[PDB]
Curated annotation (Swiss-Prot), chain A:
The gene is SKIC2. It comes from Homo sapiens. Component of the SKI complex which consists of SKIC2, SKIC3 and SKIC8. Interacts with HBS1L isoform 2. Helicase component of the SKI complex, a multiprotein complex that assists the RNA-degrading exosome during the mRNA decay and quality-control pathways. The SKI complex catalyzes mRNA extraction from 80S ribosomal complexes in the 3'-5' direction and channels mRNA to the cytosolic exosome for degradation. SKI-mediated extraction of mRNA from stalled ribosomes allow binding of the Pelota-HBS1L complex and subsequent ribosome disassembly by ABCE1 for ribosome recycling. In the nucleus, the SKI complex associates with transcriptionally active genes in a manner dependent on PAF1 complex (PAF1C). This is Superkiller complex protein 2. It is found in: Nucleus; Cytoplasm. It is linked to Trichohepatoenteric syndrome 2: A syndrome characterized by intrauterine growth retardation, severe diarrhea in infancy requiring total parenteral nutrition, facial dysmorphism, immunodeficiency, and hair abnormalities, mostly trichorrhexis nodosa. Hepatic involvement contributes to the poor prognosis of affected patients. Belongs to the helicase family. SKI2 subfamily.
Curated annotation (Swiss-Prot), chain C:
This is Superkiller complex protein 3. The gene is SKIC3. It is linked to Trichohepatoenteric syndrome 1: A syndrome characterized by intrauterine growth retardation, severe diarrhea in infancy requiring total parenteral nutrition, facial dysmorphism, immunodeficiency, and hair abnormalities, mostly trichorrhexis nodosa. Hepatic involvement contributes to the poor prognosis of affected patients. The lineage of its organism: Eukaryota, Metazoa, Chordata, Craniata, Vertebrata. It is found in: Cytoplasm; Nucleus. It comes from the Eukaryota. Belongs to the SKI3 family.
């Protein structure tokens, strides 16, 4: 590639984008691993849900499973009202770059 | 880690590539090449020589051998080494007793 | 004459050396054996140049070059070093260097060379005698 000008930090930006995310992900581990988080996780808790299904949609925990080994949380999570019924319109789309 | 994350967020929020016309393509292509490079490095290391679990112990054995008068620099056996080579048991102690 | 190979050339050089050694050691003559020694050096140099990758030829050249009648020590040291480089497992060349240094009042360095020689072959006699 040619980076002379507007693209000068393009490779370094990538590193900055990845490592920063990694730090939060490490921080994210440093979030559930704490005994204090393990105290907060109960009914009456609002959480940000991050997976392929929910993209940082706000959800509120209803209960925490008594079996704390496989922690499955029956949790009310907002999602878009489904304006579809057919799986055929879903196809791979643009890779969301991490913006600032 | 949290302060480093804060600094990375601050630096990322001023990037010039984010305003460039060709930000997504070059960037994703760089992602692909970098991922391949990292897996390439791990792959070559797996076939490399540091993988051997006991290599530090081999180095330590050579060092203890060389602190006594048994192996020259760069691993060439000296006379005490050839005496302690053809010995049944307690080679170190027996040859040390013999030379003294 | 009928098969020109290196080994016979080196052996012929050694034979001439032996002949000169015998003539001198019986005090029968001196300075009338010069041509014999010159012929021996010629044969050995021919052998070594014919194939310069064998420790035997370099070692033989080194030994002959330092005979009392010729007395060319620089060539002898060079020949022994080349012999050692050619094949690292060489007790003969190391002990010959030890002899060369020891006779020229350099006891320390000759001691080092002898120690190396016996390190490479613990049951070679000349190195032990030199140590004694």
């Amino acid at each position: 590639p040619d980076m002379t000008g507007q693209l000068v930090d393009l490779p370094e930006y990538y590193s900055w984008g990845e490592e920063l995310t990694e730090t939060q992900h490490m921080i994210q581990r440093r979030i559930m691993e704490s005994v204090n988080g393990l105290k907060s996780l109960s009914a009456g808790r609002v959480v940000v849900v991050k997976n392929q299904e929910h993209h940082n949609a706000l959800g509120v925990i209803l209960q925490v499973s008594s079996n704390s080994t496989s922690r499955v949380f029956t949790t009310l999570v907002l999602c878009d009202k489904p304006l579809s019924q057919d799986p055929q319109d879903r196809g791979p789309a643009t890779a969301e770059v991490p913006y600032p | 880690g949290g302060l480093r994350a804060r600094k990375l967020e601050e630096l990322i929020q001023g990037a010039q590539c984010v305003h460039s016309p060709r930000f997504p393509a070059q960037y994703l292509k760089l992602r692909e090449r970098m991922q391949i490079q990292k897996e390439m490095e791990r792959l070559r290391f797996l076939l490399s020589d540091q993988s051997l679990l006991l290599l530090p112990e081999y180095h330590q054995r050579v060092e203890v051998l060389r602190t006594l008068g048994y192996v020259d620099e760069a691993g060439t056996v000296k006379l005490a080494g050839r005496v302690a080579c053809a010995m049944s048991s307690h080679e170190l102690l027996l040859t040390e007793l013999m030379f003294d | 004459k009928l098969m020109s190979t290196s080994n016979t050339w080196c052996d012929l050089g050694i034979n001439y050396y032996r002949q000169a050694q015998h003539l001198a050691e019986t005090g029968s003559n001196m300075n009338d054996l010069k041509e014999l020694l010159e012929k021996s050096l010629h044969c050995l140099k021919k052998a070594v140049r014919l194939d310069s990758n064998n420790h035997l030829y370099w070692n033989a050249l080194g030994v002959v070059a330092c005979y009392s009648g010729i007395g060319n020590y620089a060539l002898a040291q060079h020949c022994f070093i080349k012999s050692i480089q050619s094949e690292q497992i060489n007790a003969v060349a190391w002990t010959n260097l030890g002899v060369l240094y020891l006779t020229n009042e350099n006891i320390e360095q000759a001691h080092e060379a002898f120690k190396m020689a016996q390190s490479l072959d613990p049951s070679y006699l000349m190195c032990w005698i030199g140590q004694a």
